[PDB]
Amino acid sequence: RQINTEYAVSLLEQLKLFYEQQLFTDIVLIVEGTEFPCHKMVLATCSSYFRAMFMSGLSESKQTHVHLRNVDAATLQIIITYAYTGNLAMNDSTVEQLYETACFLQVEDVLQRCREYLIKKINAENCVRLLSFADLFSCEELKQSAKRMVEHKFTAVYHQDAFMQLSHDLLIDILSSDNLNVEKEETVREAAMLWLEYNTESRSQYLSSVLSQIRIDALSEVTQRAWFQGLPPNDKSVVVQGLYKDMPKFFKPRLGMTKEEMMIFIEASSENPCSLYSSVCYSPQAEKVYKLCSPPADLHKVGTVVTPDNDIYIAGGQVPLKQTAFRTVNCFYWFDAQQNTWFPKTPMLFVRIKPSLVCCEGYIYAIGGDSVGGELNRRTVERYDTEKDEWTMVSPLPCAWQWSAAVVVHDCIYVMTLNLMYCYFPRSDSWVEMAMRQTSRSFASAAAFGDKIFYIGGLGSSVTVEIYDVNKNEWKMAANIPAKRYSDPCVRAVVISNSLCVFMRETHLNERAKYVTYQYDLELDRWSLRQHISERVLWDLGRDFRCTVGKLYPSCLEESPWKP
Amino acid sequence: MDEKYVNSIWDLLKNAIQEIQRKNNSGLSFEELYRNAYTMVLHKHGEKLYTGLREVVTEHLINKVREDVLNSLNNNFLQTLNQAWNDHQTAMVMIRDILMYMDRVYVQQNNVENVYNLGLIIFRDQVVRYGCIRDHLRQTLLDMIARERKGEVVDRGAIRNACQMLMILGLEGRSVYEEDFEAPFLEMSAEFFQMESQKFLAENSAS
C-alpha cells in the first residue's frame, strides 16, 4: 500500500512554504543572471543529474554558487516548482524546451509526463517537428508512435518545410519503410527529388543511398536526366555510377497501393455467443468478409464517419455498467487503418446515443444523439477540431428531432428528420429552413452523392425513395426498389464507385436473411443488379448495424474464420 | 558536424579523464565534460566513445596498477592492492557519473554492460586475473591464513577488505570470488584439518 498520507501533505506544503519564503537555502542556481535559491534535497528527488552534481565529490560539492548553463529560466522554474509542488502546468508551446531541460537534467518523472503530453499532441502540422525532436533525443516510444503517424501524414501533405531539414538516416528509414500510404509510387519519388534538389552538393553523397531504397520502376525512367541537370559540373563518378547501379534491390510493390473501396460494418451479430456484437466488412472487389477490431470496450450505439482523407472516427455510445445495464459515455476514439486498433482521442462534452457523425471543412460534426442534458436546447450539436484536438459548440438546430440522419453537401450540413430538414451554414453558424417532405418516414439513412440527397427507406422500412436537389430545393419521387413481397428489407444508402448503390438485406417468411446489392441508375431512375452477395461468405449481421464507405488494407486485416 | 570537431572533443575528454585518474580532480570542470558528453552522444557516436573509454581505461590500468602491484609484491602487497582498488573505485565514481548519462541511452539500445560494470570487468581481467598476480595473491593469502590458524595473530581487517573487494569484483554474485578464494583455501583447509585430526587421534583420547 502506501504510508500516512496526512503527514505526506503536511511536509509537502511546508517545503513549499520554505521555498517561497527563502530561508533554508544552501545552494543557489545561477542561470543567465537569475537567482534560484533552493535545496539539495528537492533537486535530488526529481533530477538524476543533481545526484551526480552534489554527491560526487567535485568542486561544486562545497561550492554554494553554481552557474548552470545551456538551460532556460522559465523551464528551470517550472521544473523546480514541480519538484516543490508537483503542479506540472504543461501548455502547448513550452513542452519542446521542457523536454530539452528534462533530458539535460535527467528528470525521469517529468520526462514521462511530457512524453505522455507529446503522445497526445502528435498531429498533422507537427508530425515532422516531433519526429526530428524524437530523433534528436532518444525517445523510441515517441519516435515509433510518431513514425507511424508521420508515415501516413507525410504522404498526405508532403509539403511541410521542416521535411527539408531532416537527417539522412531518418529519411532512409521513412522512405524504405513499408507503411507508407500512397495511391501511387510516383509521389514518394518526387518528394525525394525535391528533397535532394533542396540543397547543394551535400545531397550528392546521400543520393546514392536514397535511390537504393526506392523501387527500380522509376530509377530508369524520367527523374534521372533531371538530376544530371543538377549534377555538379564534370562529376564523372555519379552519372556513370547510376548508369550501371540499378540492377539489384528487388522491385516490389508497396503497401499504400492496397486500399480498396469497402463497406465497413459495425455492431454486427457476433458469431460466438460469448460476445454481444462484432465488427466486420464486405469487400465489393475481393468478394470476402474481413474481420475488424471490436469497438473500444464494446462501445455500442455509436456513429461512424469517413473524412475525405479516408479516416474513421467513433463518437458517442454506451458501455455496460459494472439483466439490463448500460451507461452512456462521451469517449472518442480513432481507428488505425494499419495497426487494426482504436486509438483514444479527446472525449466530447456530453454523452451521446447513436450520434450522426458528419465531416465538413475538416471538422467532425455530431448532430444530436440523445444527449444527457434534456434542457431547452435538447440537441447539443458540437463540432470537433482535427488540428487542435478539441471540441467547439456550434449554432443549435431549430427543432428538436429524434432518430435523424445527416449528410454533407456543398460544404454545408444537411440533417434530415421525419418530415423536416434544416441546412447549417458553417461560415455564418446559422440554420435555414429547407423543403418539406410529403411522407412521414423515420429510421432511415441517406447518402450524399454529388449535389443531391437520396433519402432511402423509412418508416420495418420500405422501398420509398425521395430525391432532394440542393440547387433546386425540392423533394421528388423517382421509383420504388423492386423487392420480394411479404418481406422486410433493411436498406442502407451508400456511395461507391462513383455511383449510388444500396445495401439491402431482405428476409422472407420462415426464411433466412438474404444479402444483395443494387446499382441505382441516376438518369434512368432504376435499380440495376450490380452484384449478388452469396451467403457462403457473409452471414447474418443483425438489425442495428451501420454501414459506411471507406478504404482499408486487406494485408493488415485478417479473414474472419466462420462457416458459410 | 565534421569529424575534426568530434575528434577534438574526444581528445579533450580523454585528457580530462586521464587527469582525473592521476589524482588531480580538484582543478577540473564538470559542466564542460557533461556538455561535451552531451554533444558527443547526440550525434550518434556512442560506439566510438565506448571503445575509446575501454582502451583508455585498460591502458591506464596496465601502465599504472599492473606495474605498481608487480613492483611491490613483497612490501605491503595486499595494502597496495587495496589502495589501488580504492583509487580505482573513487576515480570510477566520477567517471561513471559522467558516463552513466551516456549509459542511459547506450545500454538501453545497444544492450551492453554499464561503464561501472565495464571498469570492474577490465580490472578483474588485467589485475586480479593476471598470469602472475593471481597466483601470488593466492599464495600469500593462504600463507597468512595458515599462520593465523597456527596460533599467532595477524591483521584481520585487511582480509575482510580483500574478500569484500573480490565480492564486488564478482559484479553478478558469488561466481568469481567463490571459485578464486574457496578452491585453494578449501584444499588448504582440507589438508591442514586432516593432519590435525590425524595428530589428535594418537596424542590424546576421546575425553
Q: For the residues of A396-411, what is the DSSP string, one character each?
A: PPSS--SS-EEEEETT
| Cα–Cα distance for residue pair A44/A49, rounded to 1 Å | 8
DSSP class per residue in A63-131: -SEEE--S--HHHHHHHHHHHHH------SSTHHHHHHHHHHHTBHHHHHHHHHHHHHH--STTHHHHH
Pairs across A and B, CB distance < 8 A = 38
Q: Which residues of A326-363 are buried (b: 16+ CB within 10 A; e: fewer)?
A: eebbbbbbbbebbebebeebeebebbbbbbbbbbbeeb
Which residues in chain B have their CB less than 8 angstroms from residue A53's CB? 30
Helix, strand, coil shares of chain A, percent, nearest 5, are 25, 25, 50
- The pairing of strands A465-469 and A474-477 is antiparallel
- The 8-class DSSP code of residue A203 comes to G
Question: For residue A100, what is the nearest residue in chain B, using CA coordinates?
Answer: B38
CA distance A175 to A249: 14
Report CA-CA distances (Å) from A279 to A267, A368, A544, B43.
6, 24, 12, 47
What is the rounded distance in angstroms from the CA atom of residue A399 to the CA atom of residue B90? 80
**Nearest by Cα to A210 from A161, A174, A251:** A174
Least Cα distance to A439 among A455, A427, A425, A422 occurs for: A455
- Whole-angstrom distance, CA of residue B127 vs CA of residue A345: 59
Q: For residues A36 and A28, is the Cβ–Cβ distance under 8 A? A: yes
Q: Please, which residues 23-52 of chain B have a Cβ atom closer than 8 Å to chain A? A: 25-28, 30-31, 34-35, 38, 42, 44
Q: Cell numbers of A127, please?
A: 508530425
Q: At what angle do helices A140-157 and A186-198 cross, to 10 degrees?
A: 100
| Cell 566520477, residue located | B94
DSSP, collapsed to helix, strand or coil, labels residue A306 as strand
8-state DSSP, B128: I
Dist. CA A364–CA A333, nearest whole Å? 12
**Within a 10 A sphere around the Cβ of B165, how many other Cβ atoms?**
18
Strand partners, A548: A264
Specify whether the CB–CB gap between A380 and A370 falls below 8 A: no
Report the SS3 class of residue A474: strand
Query: Which of A56, A67, A68 is facing B94, going by the closest CB pair?
Result: A56
Question: Measured between alpha carbons, how far is A356 from A371 in angstroms, rounded to an integer?
Answer: 12
Helix (H), strand (E) at residue A507: strand A499-507
Task: Give rounded-to-5 percent helix, strand, coil for chain B.
Answer: 80, 0, 20
Give which of B94, B70, B83 is closest to B21, Cα–Cα. Answer: B94
Q: CB B42 to CB A138 under 8 A?
A: no
Strands A27-31 and A65-67: parallel
How open is the CA angle B115-B52-B61, to the nearest 5 degrees? Answer: 70
Rounded CA gap, A153 and A147, in Å? 9
Task: Tell me the resolution in Å.
Answer: 6.7
Q: Is residue A29 within 8 Å of A67, Cβ to Cβ?
A: no
- CB spacing of B98 vs A106 below 8 angstroms: no
Alpha helices in A246-363 (DSSP H): none
B97 and chain A in contact, CB less than 8 A: yes
**Contact call for residues A290 and A557 (beta carbons, < 8 A):** yes
Which chain B residues have a beta carbon less than 8 Å from that of A60?
30
Query: What does the alpha-carbon distance between residue A557 and residue A339 come to, in Å, rounded to a whole number?
Result: 9
For residue A358 the three cell numbers come to 458528419
